[PDB]
Amino acid sequence: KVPSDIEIAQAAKMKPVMELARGLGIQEDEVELYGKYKAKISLDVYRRLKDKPDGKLILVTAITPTPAGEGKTTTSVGLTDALARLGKRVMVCLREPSLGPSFGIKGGAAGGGYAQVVPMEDINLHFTGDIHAVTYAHNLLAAMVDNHLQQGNVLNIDPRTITWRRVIDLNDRALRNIVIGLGGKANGVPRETGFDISVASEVMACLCLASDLMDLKERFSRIVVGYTYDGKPVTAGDLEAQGSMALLMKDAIKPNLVQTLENTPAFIHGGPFANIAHGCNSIIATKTALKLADYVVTEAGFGADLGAEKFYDVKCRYAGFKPDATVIVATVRALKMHGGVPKSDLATENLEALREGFANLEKHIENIGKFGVPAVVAINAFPTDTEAELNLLYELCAKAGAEVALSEVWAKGGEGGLELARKVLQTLESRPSNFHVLYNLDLSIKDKIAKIATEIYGADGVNYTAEADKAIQRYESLGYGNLPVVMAKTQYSFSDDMTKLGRPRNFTITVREVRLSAGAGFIVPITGAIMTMPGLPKRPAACNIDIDADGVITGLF
């Protein structure tokens, strides 16, 4: 046959999230329905199971992204199916996808094939309106700033230094750079600013790293909006915003229980950028998944260079977390591109090029080892991947020195990854973890980037532009020196040079600019231009998206 990811999403039987919440010991009144098959879970399921056994934590990451695509979520879902098939109490924790791209290049399944989270349609759109709550908390702050300038600028802000932008969850490039506040004294103060996609919001970040609402509230209050003419940081604190922002977020703070194509209890909650932030789902979803399972499968954005590292250094750091196993996804087609084979050429097998690419994966694996974490490997399998190829790889992974398996979940459900399932258990009974943070918050900023760039990206050194040192000297000086560091750089290389594939060496990194996220609580060094507002294409999906008399949706997927 020939089924597509939408049909496999419709066709499937979903169980009322209510009775899955019972199949997890969640009380009737800790749920909060959204139709029969979506629901939010209250902040008491943690608060009451406050001390209970935290089950085991299984971060899935990937090798360096490629035009091939690797499907890091699928393999992360169809593994959760396996663990449950082998009758284990296992939850997946995923990220809420942005609305905007469903109308740009099309929406895609949570995971894929036969390793999906459902109902897919809802997840891609409004879902439980989590993003909307972010949007409005960001935008009210924005409004509150501009209003304050209107009301006489009591705090004496220079409007030209305001760093607080606006958000919306569409790909709209016409809003990147705009002028607001025009039309004279009645209509505000003229200034330059713009919009970023809502999922790039510091508020989106805070959500994903607040422990509870009261934590979220205060983080907000810390957020910088800009400076006074005198140069003194002004905060959301200084504008008494944080109350009203936490209120707008009252329900967004509750993680959303949904399910697998095979009824495995899933959370979906948060979803920030993996570059200017850390690309994990929220702390709240996983720490609730902890007290509720013995086995929590999760994930982080982009390659293991960025997602993993930040998962470990910022997520786990802040959350006292202690990740046990870790998967790393890889395709062979992917590693052949890392071996310098263009995409029209992966149609054939290149066994020589696959020995080349591997250096990527191995670099990753060594990095995992570096946190005191039991690395383990896994292969997404495809129609074209010959057994000569698969084996070549197979054998170079123990020749590297950590477990390996094969998954077929795209096509075989939580069976293809049954093999990989045992490995992790194998790895959890036999292989403890010895988890430390790859750096320490007491070092000054340059050392923190250094120890990151050096050991993980495998660079010899790091450089700074004029305004990179100017910014950093300004920060250490304002006191924000002791923060973690989130590395805004390209995903497709270890280096900032996006064309440098495989495992490049002898290069160095260059920090062009440095930004602050006081509310999220980290420093963001930038190496490229960052696209914080993608744009629609020449022939977008919004043009052919239709819904007819019956609710039948053509074009969306």
Ligand X SMILES: Nc1nc(=O)c2nc(CNc3ccc(C(=O)N[C@@H](CCC(=O)O)C(=O)O)cc3)cnc2[nH]1
Hey, which residues between 57 and 116 contact a copy of itself (CB under 8 A)?
Answer: 99, 103
- Closer to ligand X by Cβ: residue 281 or 407: 407
Q: Is 406 in the site for ligand X (CB under 6 A)?
A: yes
Strand-pairing partners, residue 59, are 298, 326
- Please choose which of a copy of itself, ligand X, none residue 549 contacts, taking the beta carbon within 5 to 8 angstroms, the exact cut-off set by kind: a copy of itself
382 is catalytic: yes
SS3 at position 123: helix
- Applying the rule CB under 6 A, the residues between 46 and 85 that interact with ligand X are 71
Q: Find out whether 432 is annotated in a ligand binding site.
A: no
Print burial letters for 511-549: b (CB count within 10 Å at least 16), e (below 16). Answer: bbbbbbbbbbbbbbbbbeebebbbebeeeebeeebeeee
- Please choose which of ligand X, a copy of itself, none residue 385 contacts, taking the beta carbon within 5 to 8 angstroms, the exact cut-off set by kind: ligand X
- Please choose which of ligand X, a copy of itself, none residue 11 contacts, taking the beta carbon within 5 to 8 angstroms, the exact cut-off set by kind: none
Nearest approach in angstroms of CB 508 to a copy of itself is: 27
Q: Find out whether 315 is annotated in a ligand binding site.
A: no
Q: Is 478 in the site for ligand X (CB under 6 A)?
A: no
d(CA 74, CA 404): 17
SS3 at position 74: helix
Q: What are phi and psi of 468, to 5 degrees?
A: -70, -40
106 is catalytic: yes
Q: Please spell the DSSP secondary structure of 408-429, one letter per residue.
A: -HHHHGGGTTHHHHHHHHHHHH
C-beta of residue 256 within 8 angstroms of C-beta of residue 38: yes
* Annotated catalytic residue within 62, 82, 84, 274: 274
Residues 6 or more apart whose CB falls under 8 angstroms from that of 321 comprise 57, 286, 287, 315
Q: Find out whether 71 is annotated in a ligand binding site.
A: yes
- Applying the rule CB under 6 A, the residues between 336 and 395 that interact with ligand X are 380-383, 385, 390
Instruction: Please state, in angstroms and as integers, the Cα–Cα distance from residue 178 to each residue in 165, 195, 235, 384, 464, following that order.
Output: 10, 8, 23, 48, 29
Stretch that binds ligand X, among 166-174, 212-220, 404-412, 451-459 (CB under 6 A): 404-412
When binding is defined by CB under 8 A, the residue of 53, 69, 231, 243 that contacts a copy of itself is 243
- Residue 489 CB coordination number (10 Å): 26
Q: Is 275 in the site for ligand X (CB under 6 A)?
A: no
Q: Find out whether 68 is annotated in a ligand binding site.
A: yes
- Closer to a copy of itself by Cβ: residue 369 or 555: 555
| H or E, element range at 145 | helix 130-150
Nearest approach in angstroms of CB 224 to a copy of itself is: 18
d(CA 122, CA 457): 37
Q: Is 143 in the site for a copy of itself (CB under 8 A)?
A: yes
The tally of CA atoms less than 13 A away on the side-chain side of residue 107 is 27
Question: Per DSSP, which regions of 163-213 are E strands?
Answer: 166-168, 178-180, 191-193, 195-197
Q: Is 439 in the site for ligand X (CB under 6 A)?
A: no
- Applying the rule CB under 8 A, the residues between 469 and 498 that interact with a copy of itself are none
72 is catalytic: yes
- Please choose which of a copy of itself, ligand X, none residue 179 contacts, taking the beta carbon within 5 to 8 angstroms, the exact cut-off set by kind: a copy of itself
410 is catalytic: yes
When binding is defined by CB under 8 A, the residue of 240, 352, 447, 467 that contacts a copy of itself is 240
d(CA 207, CA 246): 10
Nearest approach in angstroms of CB 411 to ligand X is: 4
Residues that bind ligand X (CB under 6 A): 71, 380-383, 385, 390, 406, 408, 410-411
